[PDB]
Write an enzyme that holds these catalytic residues in place. Sequence first.
Site, PDB file in Angstrom:
ATOM      1  N   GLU A   1       0.961   6.087  11.387  1.00 30.08           N
ATOM      2  CA  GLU A   1       1.933   5.213  10.670  1.00 30.08           C
ATOM      3  C   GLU A   1       3.423   5.442  11.060  1.00 30.08           C
ATOM      4  OE1 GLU A   1       1.448   2.494   9.027  1.00 30.08           O
ATOM      5  OE2 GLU A   1      -0.720   2.542   9.301  1.00 30.08           O
ATOM      6  N   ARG A   2       4.449   4.966  10.315  1.00 28.93           N
ATOM      7  CA  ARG A   2       5.859   5.065  10.754  1.00 28.93           C
ATOM      8  C   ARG A   2       6.441   6.479  10.711  1.00 28.93           C
ATOM      9  NH1 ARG A   2       5.194   0.345   7.569  1.00 28.93           N
ATOM     10  NH2 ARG A   2       5.878  -1.553   8.447  1.00 28.93           N
TER      11      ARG A   2
ATOM     12  N   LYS B   1       0.829  -1.236   0.000  1.00 29.91           N
ATOM     13  CA  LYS B   1       0.000   0.000   0.000  1.00 29.91           C
ATOM     14  C   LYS B   1       0.853   1.272   0.000  1.00 29.91           C
ATOM     15  CE  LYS B   1      -2.269  -0.733   3.778  1.00 29.91           C
ATOM     16  NZ  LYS B   1      -1.729  -1.981   4.363  1.00 29.91           N
TER      17      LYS B   1
HETATM   18  N1  LIG Z   1       8.540  -5.424  -4.798  1.00 30.64           N
HETATM   19  C1  LIG Z   1       8.427  -5.464  -3.463  1.00 30.64           C
HETATM   20  N2  LIG Z   1       9.232  -6.329  -2.873  1.00 30.64           N
HETATM   21  C2  LIG Z   1       9.124  -6.390  -1.532  1.00 30.64           C
HETATM   22  N3  LIG Z   1       8.283  -5.675  -0.759  1.00 30.64           N
HETATM   23  C3  LIG Z   1       7.482  -4.830  -1.411  1.00 30.64           C
HETATM   24  C4  LIG Z   1       7.511  -4.691  -2.758  1.00 30.64           C
HETATM   25  N4  LIG Z   1       6.607  -3.800  -3.244  1.00 30.64           N
HETATM   26  C5  LIG Z   1       5.998  -3.395  -2.120  1.00 30.64           C
HETATM   27  N5  LIG Z   1       6.522  -3.983  -0.960  1.00 30.64           N
HETATM   28  C6  LIG Z   1       6.007  -3.845   0.412  1.00 30.64           C
HETATM   29  O1  LIG Z   1       5.109  -2.723   0.449  1.00 30.64           O
HETATM   30  C7  LIG Z   1       4.846  -2.429   1.812  1.00 30.64           C
HETATM   31  C8  LIG Z   1       4.165  -1.043   1.855  1.00 30.64           C
HETATM   32  O2  LIG Z   1       3.257  -0.843   2.968  1.00 30.64           O
HETATM   33  P1  LIG Z   1       2.266  -1.990   3.480  1.00 30.64           P
HETATM   34  O3  LIG Z   1       2.987  -2.899   4.370  1.00 30.64           O
HETATM   35  O4  LIG Z   1       1.620  -2.696   2.355  1.00 30.64           O
HETATM   36  O5  LIG Z   1       1.225  -1.079   4.155  1.00 30.64           O
HETATM   37  P2  LIG Z   1       1.171  -0.822   5.684  1.00 30.64           P
HETATM   38  O6  LIG Z   1       2.546  -0.695   6.211  1.00 30.64           O
HETATM   39  O7  LIG Z   1       0.810   0.605   5.668  1.00 30.64           O
HETATM   40  O8  LIG Z   1       0.183  -1.646   6.407  1.00 30.64           O
HETATM   41  C9  LIG Z   1       6.240  -2.474   2.429  1.00 30.64           C
HETATM   42  O9  LIG Z   1       6.186  -2.875   3.810  1.00 30.64           O
HETATM   43  C10 LIG Z   1       7.020  -3.475   1.523  1.00 30.64           C
HETATM   44  O10 LIG Z   1       7.421  -4.620   2.261  1.00 30.64           O
HETATM   45 MG   LIG Z   2       2.545   0.718   4.889  1.00 32.03          MG
END
Ligand SMILES: Nc1ncnc2c1ncn2[C@@H]1O[C@H](COP(=O)(O)OP(=O)(O)O)[C@@H](O)[C@H]1O
Ligand SMILES: [Mg+2]
Lengths: 51, 51, 509, 86, 456, 456, 177
Positions: free
Chosen positions: F179-180, F153
């Site tokens: 968030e962070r 996301k």
């Molecule tokens: N190609 C990728 N390879 C590894 N991780 C990815 C990749 N594309 C996106 N991410 C992941 O996208 C995440 C972005 O936030 P997300 O965890 O989905 O939302 P939230 O932290 O807000 O709940 C990152 O923690 C990262 O691990």
């Molecule tokens: Mg995130």
Amino acid sequence: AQAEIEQELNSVKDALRAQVGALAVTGAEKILGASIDANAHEQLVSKLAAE
Amino acid sequence: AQAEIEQELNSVKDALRAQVGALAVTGAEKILGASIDANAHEQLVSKLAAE
Amino acid sequence: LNPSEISEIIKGRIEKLDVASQARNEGTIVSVSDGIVRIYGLADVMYGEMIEFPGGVYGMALNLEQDSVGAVVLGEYQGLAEGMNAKCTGRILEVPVGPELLGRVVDALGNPIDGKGPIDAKATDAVEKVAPGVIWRKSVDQPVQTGYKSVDAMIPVGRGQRELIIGDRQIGKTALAVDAIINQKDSGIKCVYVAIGQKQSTIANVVRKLEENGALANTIVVAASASESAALQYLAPYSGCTMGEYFRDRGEDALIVYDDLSKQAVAYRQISLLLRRPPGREAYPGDVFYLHSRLLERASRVSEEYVEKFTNGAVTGKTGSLTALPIIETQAGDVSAFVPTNVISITDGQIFLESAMFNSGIRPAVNAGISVSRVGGAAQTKIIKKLSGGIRTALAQYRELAAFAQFASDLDEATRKQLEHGQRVTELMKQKQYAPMSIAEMSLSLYAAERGFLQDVEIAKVGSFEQALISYFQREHAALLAKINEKGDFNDEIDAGIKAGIEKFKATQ
Amino acid sequence: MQQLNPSEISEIIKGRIEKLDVASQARNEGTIVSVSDGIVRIYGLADVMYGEMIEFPGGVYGMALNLEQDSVGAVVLGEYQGLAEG
Amino acid sequence: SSGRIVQIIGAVIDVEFPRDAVPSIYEALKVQGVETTLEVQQQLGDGVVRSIAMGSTEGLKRGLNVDSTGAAISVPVGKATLGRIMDVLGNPIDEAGPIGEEERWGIHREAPSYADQAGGNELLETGIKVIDLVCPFAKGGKVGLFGGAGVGKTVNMMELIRNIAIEHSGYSVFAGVGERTREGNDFYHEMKDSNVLDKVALVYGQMNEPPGNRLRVALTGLTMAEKFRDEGRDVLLFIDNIYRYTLAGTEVSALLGRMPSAVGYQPTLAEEMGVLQERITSTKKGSITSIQAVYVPADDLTDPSPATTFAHLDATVVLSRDIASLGIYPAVDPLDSTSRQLDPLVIGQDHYDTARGVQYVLQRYKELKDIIAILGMDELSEADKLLVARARKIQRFLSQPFFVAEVFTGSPGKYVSLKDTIAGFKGILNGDYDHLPEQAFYMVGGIEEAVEKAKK
Amino acid sequence: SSGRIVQIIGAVIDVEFPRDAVPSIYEALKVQGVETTLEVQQQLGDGVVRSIAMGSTEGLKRGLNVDSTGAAISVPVGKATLGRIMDVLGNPIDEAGPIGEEERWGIHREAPSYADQAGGNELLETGIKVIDLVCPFAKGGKVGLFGGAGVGKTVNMMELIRNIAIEHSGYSVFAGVGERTREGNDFYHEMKDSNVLDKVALVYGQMNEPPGNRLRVALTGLTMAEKFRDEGRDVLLFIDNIYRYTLAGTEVSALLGRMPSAVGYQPTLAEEMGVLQERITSTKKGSITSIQAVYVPADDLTDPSPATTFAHLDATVVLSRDIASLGIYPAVDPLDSTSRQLDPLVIGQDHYDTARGVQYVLQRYKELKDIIAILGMDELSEADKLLVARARKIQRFLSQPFFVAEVFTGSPGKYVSLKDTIAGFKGILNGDYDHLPEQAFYMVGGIEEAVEKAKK
Amino acid sequence: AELTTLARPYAKAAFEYAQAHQQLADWSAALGVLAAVSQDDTVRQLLKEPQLTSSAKAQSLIDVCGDKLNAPAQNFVRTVAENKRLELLPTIAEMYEQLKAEQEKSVEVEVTSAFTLSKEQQDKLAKALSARLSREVRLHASEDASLIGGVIIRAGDLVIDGSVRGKLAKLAEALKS
Ligand SMILES: Nc1ncnc2c1ncn2[C@@H]1O[C@H](COP(=O)(O)OP(=O)(O)O)[C@@H](O)[C@H]1O
Ligand SMILES: [Mg+2]
Ligand SMILES: Nc1ncnc2c1ncn2[C@@H]1O[C@H](COP(=O)(O)OP(=O)(O)OP(=O)(O)O)[C@@H](O)[C@H]1O
Ligand SMILES: Nc1ncnc2c1ncn2[C@@H]1O[C@H](COP(=O)(O)OP(=O)(O)O)[C@@H](O)[C@H]1O
Ligand SMILES: [Mg+2]
Ligand SMILES: [Mg+2]
């Protein structure tokens, strides 16, 4: 139509500006339940200038 | 078009009406706040006693 | 921009001011929390009575405890405070009613929100009422055409019936009910659309679609958007029902859509938990069944004697009706939830929409096996009743046959005949949005399928064949379509007329 | 603060105004305070034992199951609809 | 003496009376001025009683005076109730004027004693193939039609009323509990147009009515049936939905101050059901034959309400949503359905062997259905392939078009007899129809018509 | 006048004021010895009010004096907020000095009226294949990125902030809700080094913050976006995570004396969401295009918070963990994701039929998963084998290397136009690429690059 | 639960004993003394201590009141203390006076006007209210400059407004709605 409203609005605004006094004295006379002309025209000429 | 022109036209009358009504109430309040004294209670407290 | 007119309008309110004294019953606000107000002193307040607060704010009495009154605010509550006076109006919740509401957008209390001026209605009615009793009703035997052949052929709806539209999110529940409202612009049936907990831009888009299709002049739109008080969202279906009942009681027909009864149940659960009433099966109030059963039993057909008695003899020899199309949302197809379980057990039928069929391109997405109408053939015209008999159960058996014979070796003629026919009716039931069909158009489509004319047609050509056949009958057989559309009548002359036209079509185009 | 306990009824409070020590004078006898769903609440019976049988008017019998600080909660060993407050 | 309304919360109302004048449990109270009645559920103490209103609470106010009537809700009973429509309080809800009553009975009563119980096993023919085969009924017994939403409970009850009530020469009682007002109107005009109305007492409490009404209408209809039974008559008692009595108790239970049990039901679920179900019985004085429709929440037969109901009935007929979803009607499940009368010492060995034979074939097919769907029909044995074909044919021969279902089916209605039913199923089991196509057994009354449908 | 703290429980504080001076709902209060701000939530009676602290409560005690400010929390608005970082109360947190504000606005407002709504349908190109194909966005509309922990996301949003800023020339507002703190620092320096900062307003209330901050930060950012919309501008409003506004409400709900609803949520869940969501809209004055990330608790899309959010959006993008596990990024699910703009009257028949064709192929492939898992692909029909082969190619062609994802792998980012997106999927559906190997479609931007990748 | 809900059993028991024994004026004085004494800053503290027994709290309150509590009233204080209800004494006194006023067919009416009214007007309002209510009326007259003219009558939960401020508010709502 928006241009006609913008051009004509001040003509009705000056008409309602004159009627506020008549609405105020007739409304006060209704609320009082008795004739108010003897104690309202001197109030109108002194207070209506702020509206 | 045509219906919406009438939609705007009546809305402007209402916007003016909302300000004129407030001014007419303020006018009645200022008039009564000067026209009422001891000569009015003998015509109001006496009236309520029959209601 | 007319002067003097505005003055006389104001003089009309000054002239009629209630200058006399009034005897009233009163209380004082003790606490203000989450749309709930507690009051002391309202001794004569009745249950469900309107309470008058300072600045024209209104509330409704719901908890009449021995030492306190618990009220809900019918608007914004944040302006209220401890020590304010609470007054009592000897009137139950009422809303304006009449034909003056047609083509207007209003709030749950009947105030206009379309900015098209005042509603010069000449009649108000109570929001909460009891439906007409057993002896005053009449059996449902008149049709309500939705314009969709899958619904009008397999799951028919009659004047005074209650048909549930149920499925998951984003699969055409609103599209089915709005197209059913659009199809009534020439039927003589008045329409009501109630939006509960929707965003205001979604409501504005539905109104724009009703206006672009010419259906808005025959519809009343009642809005209780997502930002409005839970009390207004809880009351909106009853206000809309009351506006629809005006036509029913006067020997006229009406149709009402409740776009989300599951959002009305969530608003009622909020109020009930804030009033501290004990929770049930999913934190929902104990009386959540009675919330919907009290609403849905008003949608009915009333006898000539009821209309004659209601109108004091002004209307005679005419029945009246209110047809309802409530909508319910499920989570991942789960029907075991408390609210979905209650509503499926109240309506006169249901239309199940399936996400797997919707993703597979069957866009009306009606599951014929799970969907059913409890009025059946009594709600259909003679021509559709004869041409659609057994189609629903035949499709239900085709879906099973297609799965059972999927990996088996070549079967007998009875099996091939049933399978090849079910595939053609499956492709035929597909329709586009904002494109309703008349009785004659649906009839030609049903006739070409059930009389065997589609047997030579390829599955991938059924849509093109239907569209061309309709366009041909519209140019070369216009007088026959006009005869079928008068009352949906059928006889050997019309049967032979359709046969001759379909044969000539396939043999020459 | 806390809701009314079963002994907080005007007839019981009015009795302690006449004789402060009205209870404990007849530790083997009590008065029915409330009746609902086959359960009877009684004021008194200070010497009832857990699981003992209670005798009501009309040959009806109950069993003592809740010996609370202010009242006894008893269950009827038959039909409860004939029992009443007092 | 008189009391005053002290509190109102939904359908529940608290009334205060003098301590020397508290009304009894289940006693009826009347509000002054307003046209409403209250039933005492509990005596709260300090002269206050908790009651459920037998009407809407919108007009009620605190401080209204209330009169104690000295007795429970009392309804008219006997011959004057026949051919009339009535509410929970026994008032006429038809335009035919006052009831010609001579006696009134209170709706709350003790069940007949252990020494008063009947013992009859007289078989009753229904004219429905599946029911007459696996669920044989008996005169003076209790029948339950279990099923979810939209599977045929009302339709099967209407076919049973047509095949039993009309032909019967005793009195009937029909109680519509939490029913749709449209079904009540269609049935009234149906009994009136069929000239049957003079034999039936009709009591209606539909879904638009307050919780107090739906909580007591079953006791009103049963009180009228008990008057006829105690006169030495044989009576028929029909209840369109007994689940609605339990639900009205769940809706009001929490407002009565009761803590909830499993699945959100009232703690008194088994006793409230037992107090009602034990009165619906045949005795040494007279008999009551009863058919009840039992709603199954979310089609789950393990839900506390349906699960507590099975033990009260002699014949249990189970309707399946999976069979209804295949266009097969009546949608009855031969494996889950059962009856106390399905015994060789009660009916005969020929009937019993045919019933167990049908069940055996359908039970074996249930495990093969999942096999054919993944690996195909060709991988089964020569005996399994033949058995599967007979099971699919048996599954279709259970279907039958009813006279009350002509509006849904389009085809005419068929009545089938016990001997005809037995002969048809024995023929399919023995292999006399292995050459007929599967579609020939779908919707065709007796076995002859299946042989004829195969030619069309 | 002034009041006195009477009770303290976590983030919730009760204050008593003179009966003639009780503060209004949402009014801001200040503690005299620490200057901690409190927001009034409700009036309890007897001059007592309940409030939520806009900071830490550690070190506060009963009896401290509290001052009422006569108004709600007011924040600076207008041009002075661009290129600055602010907290929930509108204070600068970037060490760059005071904000040169001309006016302040209260954070609580009613949504624009039904007559003020805008009917915009103008297509917005994102340069991302899966989004532009099945989830077309529109100018002045609302987008939601739904997903569990670590699914994409924040990356898929930052790629949208980068791509949308190519055509957009106005202002942006960013609200960081729960968030962070490290990601707020990374984003601030990235824009400062890229010279993009002077057109963005930044508001933060991250995970380190107490419940009151996380509960009101969304309102502070939206108040700044509403100032720019009402000035007649076209602005972008980005909300880092809208679920945190609802969660901060759950932490405080039991302390506010409210009875809990399903799975422990506040009874006001849908109203708290509607009061915020309805303000985030375009009007006849100006437009707000908004993108919001929506967290999905324990990957459950049926959870009350995600379930209540879908109805407030024009485009719904559903990210999946099963798709992310295969290697595909962005991990969007074509069958669960949807948009109001996916209509023949908005995007034209060519785009609409390509998108519908892709969904039909992916749906049919999903139905075969269990059969393929037990028996393998070789048992399928010649038609199903061809469809599964195209489904595998479509599923891989939906992947795309992003310009913000370059640090994770090394590959350069790709921007694909709507024309190139439609041409690639139309060719794969028609069968124009049946000969190329399945791995040639994985991570290649436009369709011509799949032809060059197949040469290796 | 409101304080009025908890005080009802006790106020009613005290009223019925006082009525049956012809002690209505004695209990009116006793409950008034207990309500005032229990609200004192030193007594309020003593009654909240966790180390004192119910009987010690009751005896301390009885020793302080002394002469004003007869044997029945002392027994009532010991009953309120055993049930842990000493915080309700001010509410018990308030509810006892309401039962007494309703029994003695008496009503206390608050009255407010813009400027003072004569004894002739007060006695005219008093006879009119006593004729309408069928009770003895005690007019607690007062003035409030917030009223532009006229008078407002508050007979418990019943309110009769004949003031000019109320008419101006009706006009503001009529024009605004
Ligand atoms: N190609 C990728 N390879 C590894 N991780 C990815 C990749 N594309 C996106 N991410 C992941 O996208 C995440 C972005 O936030 P997300 O965890 O989905 O939302 P939230 O932290 O807000 O709940 C990152 O923690 C990262 O691990
Ligand atoms: Mg995130
Ligand atoms: N017959 C149809 N043919 C093609 N597409 C259709 C058809 N019916 C509906 N759709 C489309 O599918 C989507 C259905 O949206 P709709 O709002 O009607 O569903 P919904 O169940 O009410 O969704 P929501 O849960 O958001 O309210 C829309 O994009 C609509 O245009
Ligand atoms: N035997 C049957 N034949 C045809 N349709 C039936 C049959 N039983 C039920 N139905 C269908 O179901 C509805 C009536 O069943 P009903 O008795 O109301 O079910 P339930 O009582 O279980 O809700 C109608 O829509 C009708 O078409
Ligand atoms: Mg919808
Ligand atoms: Mg039924």
